[PDB]
Amino acid sequence: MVKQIESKTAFQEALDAAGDKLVVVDFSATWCGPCKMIKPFFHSLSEKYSNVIFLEVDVDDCQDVASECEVKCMPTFQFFKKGQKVGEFSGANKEKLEATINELV
Amino acid sequence: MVKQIESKTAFQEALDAAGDKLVVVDFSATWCGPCKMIKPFFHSLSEKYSNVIFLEVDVDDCQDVASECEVKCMPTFQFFKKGQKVGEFSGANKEKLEATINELV
Structure with missing residues (x-):
């Protein structure tokens, strides 16, 4: 399930x-x-990929996390592996989302 | 001067x-x-172009205007002429901002 970050x-x-x-x-x-x-x-x-952690950050709620992650477009998906960002893109593209997950998993 | 829309x-x-x-x-x-x-x-x-109206809309304050104008990136500049949108781009590009103003004025 998706974790809500506050x-x-x-x-x-x-x-x-x-x-x-x-x-x-x-x-x-x-x-x-x-x-x-x-x-x-x-x-x-x-629910499909249990070997992957899914996080949700509302930019209004966490302006500080939003700012520090240099987010500028909505929605923005950032990928992390061992504390390091390894991918990122913006736009609600379904195929690309799952596709990127399969590349970095 | 810039008008603050609320x-x-x-x-x-x-x-x-x-x-x-x-x-x-x-x-x-x-x-x-x-x-x-x-x-x-x-x-x-x-202050430089007094023949042009400059508006400021904080997306947090006016979520309804933000939504209706289909804004997705920040900052987003939308250009209007007689109620009709005639231009639009996102990103804090100074040259392009003034350049677009000179094209639509």
Whole structure:
């Protein structure tokens, strides 16, 4: 399932506890249309790939995490492996989302 | 000077009262880095071109205007002429901003 991140401390902790696993972070905003459209698919993905950690960060709630991750478009997906960012793209592209997961897993 | 828009009613009114003039709308967010970097320049522009109306919309404040204008990246500049959108681009590109203003004025 998707983990809801509500603090910078929580973001760091989850990245740390992911250990070996790939972390996919969804940076969204409630006003963004595309973000709402792709949410169900993003959740479906967390149920399909249990060997991958799925994170959700609302930019309004965590402006500090948003800023530090240099997010500028919505939605933005950032991929992390052992605390290091290994991928990133923006736009609600379903195929590309799953496709990128299969490349970095 | 730059007009601060704080409602959907205010957005429509300003578009209406612009009459013949070109309206440049800056869709920004306080957490967005690029948005802060280009704010001074955007204001400088409003003082340089008095025949052009400059609008500022914080996406957090006006989620409804943000949504209806289909904004997805920050900052986003939308250009309006007689109620109709005639241009649009995202990213804090100074040259392109002024350049687009000179094309649509």
